């Protein structure tokens, strides 16, 4: 992100001897244009993956046991059957991550092979007037097809219509005169309007390849600094007339960024400067982190606690084995024939309980995560059939986070809103025409208390009837060649009635003049379609102007043709040509576009301006007006502002010939002037429009994604607070936040700005302005003027939405609001008490910094739902990257975790899938750490007898077939196929997700309780068989000889396996035919495999365990009481804590079995615009 390290790009000029050190290769090298989003580089995949795997401390412990059982010979058997499990686990993780990176590489190869045209015919010398008309051109120089990966610095690139620009290019030529290309920056910024880019002045002479092959020049450019509104270059060439070097500045407007889509333009020819990583996106992109989960870290801490227990056990074993060796007289010095002795005893007891944390922990968690990701991928309600895109996860280890997600940082381009603009309402002569049932009004009516579903369907039916009536009336009134009902966004029926003359003559005349003015003041171009010649489409610089012209052509006021001085208008069928005398273009600083036409009648002039509401209301005449249309129009606009409709205003005025003569005189004074002629045109534009007569206003709704106002409601009910890290500007963001029910009508909008209207009171350096604004907003409404006394107490609240305000920050105010530490804490403490924190004009780095601020400070789980190449940084640095997929966003879906079809799927990827996965892992981890304590503890409890000499109580084949076959599959099934409540009741009652917010399911006290239960269980599992043997040790129903330590081992293993499986089944929330089947199958596996191993050849010491143990009534008499006494405490505690102190889930399940949620279907989804009333 450094602006230094400049560069120089030549064309048709060999580099001087200063850059090439006699090898023909310049010292400077430029990175390849290949985009690389893979997590692990294909050259360093194995070392990075092995280091990432060995981050976990259990892997280091396994490696330590390996290297200390291999070097220390004659302590264990051959180590060839101890390294294989660890190596297999590591290679399994390696193959899994390699498959993930292969998927990402497939995506990168699909992205990199896009077609582009590169100048072929002249070799490149970089990596391996203007036109000299004297020399003949080159007939082989053309624009040949090529890919993006082979676009080197200095290659002339031609971009066709609707073609994505490969890399940063210096504009050289365009089909249009003056070279005014239009680019769609919807990926690099929030601007929905097409940005205009001018080419170079001297480079306009060339028009084809035959002219550029004779061009020779060089561009000295600054280093890539990752900024979207700044660039400094120097174009330089040599004149063909005389001998001299000519220089020309190159600003940002002559730059074609990577993610920019060349739209509404035939072809743009330019020269590439930055490539690959040097582009303005790949620097604001990031480094595609590994994205570790959250439960993994607490898992490492739990592994450390298990290490502590193992060390305690081994210490108390090595003490007693070493105190017993110093006691006389023992039976060892007769028949059996202290530093190093105690040391070898300790390191024998270490290998004894070497499985207090088994090798199957980091291979069970990985299997569970992959299975949960696959079950996410194969969900039918997360499939968007509009483009055949299921919810494909790209980071498989991030699956339990979605159950702990608390903050959601949305976008506003392809995430909250679609890319359509529909004209909805208008105000003509103080009369409001237009019908619409906005989902904001639906949420408002729901909050009032009235019915929404039935009433909503009724209202929609009425709108449909009014629409068909309007279509019939407009088709019966006249015939228009451009008319089409599918593009008729307007629906009102009173408009056509008052346009045909059902409300007098003046009203009809005013409506006609307004509809004509809508098709006059615009820079819209008309292009005949490719397939249908009669269907002439409107190519405009902005979508709102396109919507205005479309709803004008619908009402019988079509605008066609762009003549020299004039434009054709088909009014109801009759074609008339006007005369656009002047067109004052819509500037970003003017916010109003004006047209001065010559209307006959000497004739008169007509000035029609279209602009914002307040901007045009300022340039009005409160004296010569209706004085009744102004109040009505203001009320209607204030009404439309509360419905997400970005309203405009239209004002016309008549002029005589002397006024227009005076105006063109001062214009010719100002137009052909020098020394900053801009201010002159601004003031003449201001003085011509100092007075105007408002003749109507408009209203264009920016349609959101389906079911967004209800998905937001579900998420806010679950407790998931959401911020809107918007793009383009402020007013668009405000009306959108009004559209989706984020901004209410009574919420005060705390504006945090730098050079606004409330900054004159604190007029100083912007830092002090922002500080004073934040402090005054943290003082009167909610007095918390402080940093470490309120933030430290608010961090231990887990997040509860409250405050009833909203906050709007700009780009510069944000850049200042998170540059200092105290400012960071103050800004964050402010936003934490707000309801609807927004943002405006935020660069990628700034939104990434906001996400990092919310993540690091006030540690929570953030979500980064968003589409666009500018949203990549915040997606990567948010631990959950949900990139909206489609045929538009092909860079924020790659460098992300999940790629859902549209935003309305988040409230299912997070509310039912995420909660499920989080609860499943939070129940699996303690179960897994408890099912191993109950086993190795028995090996220890056999130590207080035998005096800790190191004799295995179980056979050498039960230590490797207990953590592998007897009890692993039930735990995997509890973690893959468990459900708190069905998805219908999950999305019906989202408040249960609050449990995942407070971190109330996976805490260390739960793990300690489970380990204590394992200790008690193991005590019982060992001391019931012993107490059976404790009196006379002859319990076999025929004498005949029991009591081999392997038989007691079978007793203990049976009790422990049955207790562990029934424990897994007790804590499971639902009992289905799969988990119960596999639990019974695991029990049968234990029994039948004992039966197969004992009754076999290579079972030397055993050889009859099954026939000699399972056939006695004492075995079952011990097994039943063992299972009952291991399950009775936990079951009683559950039955009391689910009767005396029931949590939320218990009450939800009780009322679910009572019959509260027994009307809704199986695949219920409240975020669906097509669900019936169920």
């Amino acid at each position: 992100n450094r602006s230094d390290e400049l560069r120089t790009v030549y064309y048709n000029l060999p580099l001087p001897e200063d850059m090439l050190d006699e090898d023909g290769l310049p010292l400077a090298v430029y990175p390849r244009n290949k985009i690389r989003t893979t997590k692990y580089t294909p050259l360093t995949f194995f070392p990075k993956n092995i280091l990432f795997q060995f981050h976990n401390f259990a892997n280091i412990y396994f490696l330590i046991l390996l290297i200390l059982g291999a070097f220390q010979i004659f302590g264990v058997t051959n180590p060839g059957f101890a390294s294989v499990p660890l190596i297999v686990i590591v290679i399994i993780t390696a193959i899994k991550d390699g498959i993930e990176d292969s998927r990402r590489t497939v995506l990168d190869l699909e992205v990199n092979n896009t077609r582009t045209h590169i100048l072929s015919g002249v070799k490149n010398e970089n990596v391996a007037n203007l036109v000299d008309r004297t020399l003949q051109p080159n007939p082989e120089c053309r624009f040949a097809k090529d890919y993006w990966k082979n676009v080197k610095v200095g290659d002339i690139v031609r971009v066709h219509n609707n073609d994505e620009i490969p890399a940063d290019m210096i504009l050289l030529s365009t089909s249009d005169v003056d070279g005014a290309c239009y680019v769609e920056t919807k990926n690099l910024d929030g601007e929905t309007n097409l940005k205009v880019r001018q080419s170079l002045k001297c480079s306009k002479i060339i028009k084809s390849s035959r002219d550029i092959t004779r061009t020779k020049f060089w561009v000295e450019s600054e280093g890539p600094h990752a900024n979207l509104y700044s660039y400094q270059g120097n174009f330089k060439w040599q004149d063909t007339q005389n001998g001299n070097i000519r220089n020309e500045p190159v600003n940002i407007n002559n730059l074609l960024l990577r993610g920019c889509t060349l739209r509404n333009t035939k072809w743009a020819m330019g020269m590439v400067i930055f490539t690959g990583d040097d582009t303005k996106i790949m620097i604001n992109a990031g480094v595609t982190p590994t994205k570790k989960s959250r439960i993994s870290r607490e898992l490492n801490f739990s592994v450390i606690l298990n290490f502590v227990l193992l060390f305690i056990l081994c210490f108390t074993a090595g003490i007693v084995n070493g105190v017993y060796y110093k006691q006389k007289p023992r039976s060892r010095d007769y028949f059996e024939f202290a530093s190093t002795n105690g040391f070898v005893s300790f390191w024998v007891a270490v290998i004894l309980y070497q499985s207090l944390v088994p090798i199957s922990l980091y291979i069970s968690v990985e299997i569970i995560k992959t299975a949960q990701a696959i079950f996410i991928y194969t969900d039918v309600l997360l499939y968007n059939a509009k483009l055949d895109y299921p919810c494909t996860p790209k980071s498989w280890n991030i699956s339990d986070d979605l159950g702990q997600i608390e903050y959601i940082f949305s976008d506003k381009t392809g995430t909250l809103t679609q890319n359509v603009m529909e004209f909805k309402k208008c105000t003509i002569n103080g009369v409001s025409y237009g019908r619409a049932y906005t989902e904001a009004l639906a949420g408002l009516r729901k909050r009032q208390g009235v019915d929404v579903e039935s009433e909503g369907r009724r209202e929609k039916e009425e709108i449909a009837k009014d629409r068909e009536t309007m279509i019939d009336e407009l088709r019966s009134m006249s015939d228009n060649t451009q008319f089409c009902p599918e593009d008729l966004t307007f629906v009102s029926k009173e408009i056509v009635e008052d346009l045909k003359g059902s409300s007098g003559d003046h009203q009809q005349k005013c409506c006609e003049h307004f509809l004509l003015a809508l098709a006059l003041c615009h820079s819209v171009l008309v292009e005949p379609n490719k397939d249908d010649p009669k269907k002439l489409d409107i190519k405009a610089q902005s979508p709102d102007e396109s919507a205005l012209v479309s709803t004008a052509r619908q009402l019988g006021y079509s605008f066609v043709g762009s003549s020299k001085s004039g434009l054709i208008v088909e009014i109801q069928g009759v074609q008339k040509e006007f005369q656009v005398l002047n067109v004052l273009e819509f500037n970003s600083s003017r916010k109003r576009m004006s047209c001065i036409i010559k209307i006959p009648g000497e004739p008169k002039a007509l000035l029609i301006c279209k602009g914002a509401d307040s901007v045009i209301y300022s340039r009005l005449d409160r004296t010569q007006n209706d004085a009744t249309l102004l109040e009505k129009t203001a009320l209607h606009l204030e009404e439309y502002a509360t419905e997400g409709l970005r309203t405009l205003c239209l004002a016309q005025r008549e002029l005589t010939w002397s006024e227009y003569e005076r105006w063109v005189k001062t214009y010719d004074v100002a137009a052909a002037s020098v020394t900053n002629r801009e201010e002159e045109l601004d003031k003449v534009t201001d003085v011509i429009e100092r007075e105007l007569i408002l003749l109507g206003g408009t209203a264009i709704e920016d349609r959101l994604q389906d079911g967004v106002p209800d998905s937001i409601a579900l998420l806010a009910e679950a407790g998931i607070k959401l911020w809107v890290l918007t793009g383009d500007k402020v007013e668009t963001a405000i009306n959108i936040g009004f559209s989706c029910n984020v901004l209410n009508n009574d919420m005060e909008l705390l504006v945090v700005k730098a050079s606004g209207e409330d900054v004159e009171e604190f007029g100083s350096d912007p830092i002090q302005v922002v500080n004073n604004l934040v402090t005054k907003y943290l003082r009167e409404k909610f007095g918390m003027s402080g940093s470490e006394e309120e933030l430290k107490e608010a961090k231990r609240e887990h997040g509860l939405p409250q405050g009833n305000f909203a906050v709007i920050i700009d780009g510069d105010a944000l850049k200042v609001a998170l540059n200092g530490e105290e400012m960071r804490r103050k800004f964050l403490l402010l936003c934490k008490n707000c309801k609807a924190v927004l943002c405006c004009r935020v660069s990628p780095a700034q939104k990434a910094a906001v996400v990092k601020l919310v993540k690091k400070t006030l540690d929570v789980m953030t979500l980064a739902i968003g589409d666009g190449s500018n949203d990549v940084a915040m997606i990567q640095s948010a631990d959950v990257g949900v990139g909206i997929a489609g045929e538009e966003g092909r860079q924020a879906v790659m460098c992300s975790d999940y790629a859902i079809g549209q935003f309305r799927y988040v409230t299912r990827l997070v509310l039912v899938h995420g909660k499920w996965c989080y609860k499943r892992l939070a129940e699996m981890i303690p179960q897994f750490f408890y099912k191993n304590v109950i086993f190795t503890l028995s090996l220890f409890w056999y130590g207080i007898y035998n005096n800790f000499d190191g004799s295995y109580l179980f056979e050498y084949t039960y230590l490797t077939f207990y953590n592998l076959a007897f009890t692993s599959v039930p735990v995997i099934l509890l973690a893959v196929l468990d459900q708190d409540v069905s998805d219908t009741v999950s999305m019906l009652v989202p408040q249960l997700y609050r449990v995942g917010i407070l971190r109330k399911e996976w805490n260390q006290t739960k793990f300690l309780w489970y380990m204590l239960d394992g200790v008690y269980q193991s005590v019982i599992c060992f001391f019931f068989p012993y107490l059976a043997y404790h009196k006379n040790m002859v319990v076999t129903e025929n004498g005949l000889g029991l009591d081999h330590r392997y038989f007691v081992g079978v007793f203990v293993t049976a009790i422990a396996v049955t207790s562990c499986n029934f424990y897994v089944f007790m804590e499971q929330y639902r009992w289905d035919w799969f988990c119960g089947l596999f639990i019974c199958l695991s029990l049968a596996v234990f029994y039948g495999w004992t039966g197969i191993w004992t009754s076999s050849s290579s079972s030397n010491e055993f050889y009859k365990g099954a026939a000699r143990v399972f056939a006695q009534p004492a075995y079952w008499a011990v097994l039943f009481v063992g299972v009952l006494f291991c399950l009775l405490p936990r079951f009683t505690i559950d039955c009391i804590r689910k009767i005396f102190y029931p949590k939320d889930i218990e009450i939800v399940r009780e009322m679910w079995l009572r019959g509260d949620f027994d009307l809704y279907p199986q695949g219920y989804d409240p975020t669906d615009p097509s669900r019936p009333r169920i």
Binding site: V76, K145, S331, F335, N946, S951, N1032, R1070, W1071, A1117
Partner: protein, 371 residues
């Protein structure tokens, strides 16, 4: 300018969508108290059965570890800290036994030699099956090196060389692999070497009416299937030698017709099964045909095993048994306690539900709909 040119839906199943057939249970006092009551009744009934069965088993345990010292050459009683009679018919029939010692000066093993004669009376019968085992308290046979000390090739009768006996896997006889002369012991390891050596009689010599003595048999005391692993020796009669503690049983070595066939030697197979815990009770005499009537009986035990040198103990244990092995009331006690605990827990839950219960399913008892 010539450059002017031109089915993934997830399979809706019952398993892919995680909508498998299931039952979602809840622990309501309508489905908890019946379970507790059923479990309690079942466990109390089973425990009553087990205790009624255990209150009938009769046993006789007599420790004789100090017969070579504390006993005399006349019929003298045994101290009260050496014998225990448990007879359910007569629960107060002490009638202490009478033991005597008859020293044999032939053996030069002063530690333990001679013969102990024990006369014990039984006032009841033992139906159709009588077991006589030897108890060895304070003998540690479950240590790390002691237990792994043998060879399963010599147990299987193979002619295992010195390498297969010494350089084997983690289960091998390391200390006693080879003697001084260079001949690998046939029974190797500290288990076979340290075998129990007291010679028990083949009958219970009667006292009352000597015309009918009660007989026993050393055949059928170990599992029959165990004869599928203990095979006959296949050694060349010149490369083996008895273990260092077996030198008094084979003072001349291993000649032609003295090599013991461990297959039909069920006591040796009984000893190659190292006991798990401290006490070691191994069956040595079995009677399957005749009932043992009342009266006095006499045992002639040949004391060849030194036990008092580590303050250990040993003795005889005579019993009929039961379906749950020897007399051990732990199972019945645990069943009774489990049943009583389940019943008390059911009663406590009933009290808490009828005195301090809650609503069935309320919309105001949740966490958010209450504050």
């Amino acid at each position: 300018e010539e450059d002017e040119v031109k089915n993934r839906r997830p399979k809706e199943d019952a398993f892919t969508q995680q909508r498998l057939a299931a039952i979602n249970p809840v622990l309501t006092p309508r489905t908890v108290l019946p379970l507790y009551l059923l479990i309690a009744v079942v466990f109390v009934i089973v425990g009553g059965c087990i205790l009624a069965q255990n209150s009938k088993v009769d046993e006789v345990t007599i420790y004789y570890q100090d017969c070579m010292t504390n006993a005399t050459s006349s019929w003298s009683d045994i101290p009260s800290e050496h014998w225990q009679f448990v007879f359910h018919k007569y629960k107060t029939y002490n009638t202490a036994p009478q033991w005597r010692f008859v020293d044999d000066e032939s053996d030069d093993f002063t530690k333990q030699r001679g013969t102990c004669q024990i006369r014990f009376t039984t006032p009841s019968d033992m139906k159709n099956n009588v077991y006589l085992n030897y108890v060895l308290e304070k003998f540690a046979a479950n240590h790390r090196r002691y237990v792994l000390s043998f060879s399963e090739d010599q147990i299987r009768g193979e002619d295992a060389s010195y390498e297969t006996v010494h350089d084997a896997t983690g289960i091998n006889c390391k200390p006693l692999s080879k003697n001084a002369d260079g001949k690998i012991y046939y029974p190797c390891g500290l288990i076979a070497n340290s075998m129990f050596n007291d010679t028990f009689p083949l009958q219970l010599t009667n006292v009352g009416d000597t015309s009918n003595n009660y007989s026993l048999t050393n055949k059928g005391i170990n599992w029959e299937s165990d004869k599928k692993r203990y095979k006959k020796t296949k050694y060349n009669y010149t490369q083996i030698a008895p273990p260092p503690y077996w030198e008094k049983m084979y003072p001349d070595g291993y000649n032609e017709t003295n090599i013991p066939d461990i297959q039909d030697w069920e006591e040796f197979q009984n000893w190659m099964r190292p006991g798990a815990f401290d006490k070691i009770t191994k069956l040595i005499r079995i009677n399957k045909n005749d009932t043992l009537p009342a009266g006095e009986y006499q045992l002639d035990i040949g004391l060849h095993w030194p036990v008092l040198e580590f303050n250990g103990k040993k003795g005889i244990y005579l019993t009929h048994g039961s379906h749950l092995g020897g007399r051990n009331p732990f199972l019945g006690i645990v069943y009774l306690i489990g049943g009583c605990i389940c019943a008390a827990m059911a009663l406590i839950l009933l009290t808490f539900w009828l005195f301090g219960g809650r609503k069935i399913a309320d919309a105001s008892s949740l966490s958010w709909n209450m504050k």
